[model samples]
Target: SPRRTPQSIPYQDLPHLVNADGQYLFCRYWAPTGTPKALIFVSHGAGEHSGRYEELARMLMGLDLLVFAHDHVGHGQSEGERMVVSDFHVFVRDVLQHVDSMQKDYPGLPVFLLGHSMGGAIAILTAAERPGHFAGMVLISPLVLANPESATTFKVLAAKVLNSVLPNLSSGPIDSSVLSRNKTEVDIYNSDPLICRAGLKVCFGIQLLNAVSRVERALPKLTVPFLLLQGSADRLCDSKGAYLLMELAKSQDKTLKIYEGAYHVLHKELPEVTNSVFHEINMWVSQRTA
Candidate 1:
């Protein structure tokens, strides 16, 4: 349950792009003032929207990279029931659709998929689905496994049944206090109307959990090079899941950078940590581009 109704978001240029569903998908893009070195299509986490990545997009632009992101169906300004998903793989298909479209729309540029939290899971599954199709991937605080601290065996078992029966049931709003150490960021997130701050749907909740399990099974087949960034103090996701991904991935070269004392949202951390993350991402992509 929300503490209160969400407040209005600041105005910006919001455009529409139709997805396979023939419904308008809310999309946003930013690019370097000069020629872009590459294009990064980002997939956001559950209950959040792409508009929240403005600062991240600007940082990528500074690195001469084009930033592309969109609200998934039912998220942000997209057309669909808010915060409800029929299948997690539908999210993967949408990501690949964006990838294919960008490859054709912007010829000759190296392309990458950047997923955060739940989006990180989507990035991994997408790469596995289309092995060797992308230049690389960037995963930030991915929700690869359920945090035992947050989810329990009892809860998981209940979800298995509820997901089939009362799929629309609310699991209640996640505690945003653990999302960041910065109080201001937490406040902003709590008030952002574009963010799905209400309780999660049982259908979507179970689907996300199942998605993580599916990825763990598929990790050995992943061929795309990836960069997974985790926060040592993240309470929302078990950091060990990232280590498991590193161990299971078959990529010739993969990097997992764990920042000590960082919170779940590493890219939005205190300037010292977040700036380093932004720079490291640029460096990782730059090396592969060369």
Candidate 2:
């Protein structure tokens, strides 16, 4: 028997022309109807692709918005090793090129961006560099900095040195236990078949650290209106980083919301609380883009 198709509107796959690493980047587009009121470009976290955003994309489309998401270089059906990067800036450049392509097609629509974890960091850095490109951004638990003790001084130094020499060297799986307060969350992540089960590569670790360093350097220059949501109990990214970023961002219109008992994946883990978070986000976007 043929499997019945799920209830979903048509979606388009956009192939991006990027000069990075001598290859073209790829992205997927979802819109409930043509000529949407707004365009949202969402970037996924490390170890996950844009596909995981299907539900969220559907929600945005229900609101009459067009959603564009891409599997960053190494994740999803895109080209590259899963969650591995030789140079961190390559990811940023890839996103920039894709955004330019999206803007060309949907010129008049207000553009916004949403990023989770690693994607969040990339969003911040990219938005800081090109503030005028977006109307607003939503950052969900951006991976600003990992626990200082996670990587010893020697380990950090060695990664930096080795990244230059062996950019593709496999580091190891990022301990999933760092993400949630509940053991089940960690267990599910580790056991999920659809999830990327690979560990972080040495080069990836180096690049991540480098990316955070760049974000911190550029924090004072971030002036675009942004909604930064963080989990107060998140072990992956602490609350201090969020506060520091909110305090440093030059955007007077920016806001920071902390979910008291939430974990890293607040959207899925805590939908009731996330309702309030999304409500605030939708309200903010409506107010500014209206």
Candidate 3:
């Protein structure tokens, strides 16, 4: 079914009580018109904000789920010097604080977390840190680990050293070409004004490496129901990372779906596939939370 354009729901954007390296963290909430059956908390990928998910929120809203999405410290509308974070743990803490506030509002209603790319990495770490914080999770083309071979150890080492000396220095666009193989899709992101053409900060690279290490270490402790959607042809995340997550997760009810020819932004790029993805998520949550 085609989704209706979302009527603006009541929403609030609250600032985090504590700052991350002097950067403010913010969370946004979108309340459905009536009582919501579930709360869906969203975390965005690198160089993006929660507002980018407005269309997806509308789709979930039609399914009667309340949506909450927040811009991580350096992304979206959040406060930060874009992709400048020396510690990814600070990102996890910001997400945790947002979830805590949502739990306060919705009480016992089933709550699920949804994250994309870097945000997906954060989601995994969050669940690993506190397994009971969410009822389940949906990870879309998560950035478990980038292709190590694609990047040289010398470059990574250089980034580490550079971050220590110039944490706020801009690195410039790493791989805008990795956005999509589809020309139209690639052009859309390339032409988008809101999208950052600048590369990631040196600190972001260090923090991401650390975040991946944490996810690897904490995999065995991940026991919550999870839905992981990965694109088989995704340039951002490989199949090995997705398989590693499924193999290590302690959850017996977890599901991993691989789209045959999809790219990194599977949900937005392939609607038919994403519809099935969303349906499976709805069914999984319904069955488990019932």
Candidate 4:
């Protein structure tokens, strides 16, 4: 039913908004007790749900920031085929739509973007679309450049060729261990039913390739101050892209912090790295909000 989410919950029972495609997108809001200093939109990567961001949101709440996020079309509690997206622009459009809605409610509050992995690509493209609309952005291991080891020219060409004939071919499940150094976090991700364990489709890989090109083209156009965080040992997104962004972006203020020996998910990495990541974000964002 149109009134029900994919999770079978009625629209009225949960915090959500119907997208332009008429699909229900599950939303999570973290509002402080009093007035918020700014608005933050948290975007998640592919196959992951917004629920995974609860801890980050809670931390931001302590700063009196109104943080919000939603499951992208095919992930989490949202309605759609699992891990399938026809066009990457759909994600950008939804982010803009959600941000606009919140902007309307809180007229003058500054807005920020916090995205991880695929969502980092979304955040970059979204901010590029509005130029100067967002106060700042925080990217955690953003997918600016695909890992060169995996996206070698020969493999990319082969993947492109295969996409024409076997678009639905499996790209295979990601190794959860590489996502973070913490075994507990790995276990949580492994056991989370909301997280898609299925192999990403060849067609989805094509969309990601498209997104990377788009992000590359958008870099020089990006003017919002941003904090780019990455791990030197990250296997999912190359740290080179983070350095490239710091150099190319037109923003007056851009910062890149690399955690030596850390993995892909800095927010969920080892104790020292995770704590440092959180502190960097809090310190960075708190200063900008004022």
Candidate 5:
């Protein structure tokens, strides 16, 4: 049995869960002072840990929602090779496992999903697995489609060919500056020890490509109410992904909100935008969970 995180923190002393893979995953919880109205599970972005969403989770808790999350396998305090996964399905599976356990403890509560970037893709596929499972979903700049500039035809093909020969080759480091307009947040992210800054492997990139196709296929089956947020200027995930989901999803209550000229991490973006982002989520969830 695993006793501690890679960081050497003892799991016995912390809130944690073991995935079906038998790996100990780090978990965090934000419970309302009184009884909670609903449950929200936060799925964080690539290379980022669940801790990054602490502020957002606390904001959600203000609505009397019990917020819970775990760092994905290979991320944060979870056990695995850093920034590596054998298949994208592992992430989706872990999310469902965690949600199932939580639902068992708090029966009869409406469940919601909040995902950002790559995590958004995970949320979509997970919700699709249980079409009527979630009350609502909040997608922030999800990876439905790779940005054309970054995943050009040539680059994608190159990655495909290289995956056969050099799957472990480091693709490149992500530029932190483009993550947000707020320098303070950027600095904080850059400084966070839990955030993996290593170059993504070619094999991992292929898994992301695989996940994109899967997300596209899942959208048509999506009927859960969802709120999608995107930054028009996001260089990481194409805003087209949001538009595409809006068109493909059969959800009658779906909504898409675009932040003009904002960056990828809108939750940590400039004050006004971040404030509005939290307000939007709070309002939407309150209306549904009320």
Candidate 6:
């Protein structure tokens, strides 16, 4: 029963990918019947596994694109202490390694990076470090600053002290109710046993805060085409972060979309708007490579 409690993922579909970080990162791939014109490498957010994006992946595959994603270290079936991140920079490096591998598998196919929530921050940092590496980037309610109200200087300094002494200690969990307005999606997330139950580890908490600040400061360095979308009502990640990025980015083709009444998870919101988000993304990527 204890073994069965872990979420059952299809190993038959995902192969072992080497990670220098020693994380047993789980990954999945989706490819259409014929040649894939492009690739969408996904980076999922905290408290969730990449498997949650299966529907989205399938849709993209149906559109003749290849989709790939992996569970971050300590989350999902990936190896490491659950929800404990030893280093945040490793996140970007992990994406780089995987993207390199994917590029080899589909040579000459334009690569696009898509990140949601914390993953969005990772995508931004990855693109900033390697300008023009991706055909474009799509940031969905990214966490450039996590729950801004909780990022006070006093809180950060206090975290640093405790982080050194108790790096593995958890801070606390976030309320899942605010994640989505869709009752069904909220219920599923709350009831899923594999969903990360632990909060941010002490040292990881420091890493997270520092990473967010780092991305915010480096926004001006990113010059790749980017589409940033935010739900104006998102309570978890500060939407102002999106606005700031829009102001700072030198990407001549940058665009920002804010869904007025949407919540944190834009793609999982009400059917009508969710369809709109997907449609916009489809058109944006298609136009770029065409």
**Candidate with the greatest TM-score versus the true structure:** 5
TM value for model 4: 0.95
**How many clashes in candidate 6?**
0
Residue pairs with backbone overlap in model 2: 173-199
Q: Please, what are the lDDT tens digits per residue for candidate 3 over residues 1-290?
A: 42111121222334333444555555566677887888888888877677767777776776678888777876655555566765788888887877777789779888888888888998888888887767898898887867565334425655557657764554545476666556676777777655566866556666777777788898889887898988887777776799888998898768998888877886666567767767776676666555
The residue-by-residue lDDT of candidate 4 on 134-220, one tens digit each, is 999999999899888656642665556565776566666666888998999999999998999887676677677788899999988
Each model's C-alpha lDDT? Answer: 0.81, 0.74, 0.72, 0.90, 0.91, 0.80
Residue-level lDDT of model 6, residues 1-290, one tens digit each, is 21111345544344646579655578788988998989988899888888778877887787788989888777777666776676788888888999999999789998888889888988999889888778999888998866765566426655566656654455666668788888888888888776885665556667677678889777889998998889988988888888988998888999999999889998888787688889888878878867
Q: What's the true lDDT of residue 286 in model 1? A: 78
Worst 10 residues of 5 by lDDT: 152-161
Q: lDDT rank, highest first?
A: 5, 4, 1, 6, 2, 3
Model 3 clash tally, residue pairs: 2
Backbone clash total, candidate 1: 0
Best by lDDT: 5
Q: Give me the overall lDDT of model 3.
A: 0.72
Candidate 2: tens digits of C-alpha lDDT, residues 110-145: 888888888999898888889666888889888786
| Superior candidate under lDDT, 2 versus 5 | 5
Error of 3 at 276 (Å): 3.4
Give candidate 6's error at residue 242 in angstroms. Answer: 0.6
What's the CA RMSD for each of the models? 4.4, 5.2, 6.2, 1.7, 1.6, 2.9
Using all chains and alpha carbons, the TM-scores for the candidates as numbered come to 0.90, 0.85, 0.85, 0.95, 0.96, 0.91
Please report the TM-score between candidate 1 and the true structure.
0.90
Candidate 1 worst ten-residue window by lDDT: 2-11
10 residues in a row with least lDDT, candidate 3? 2-11
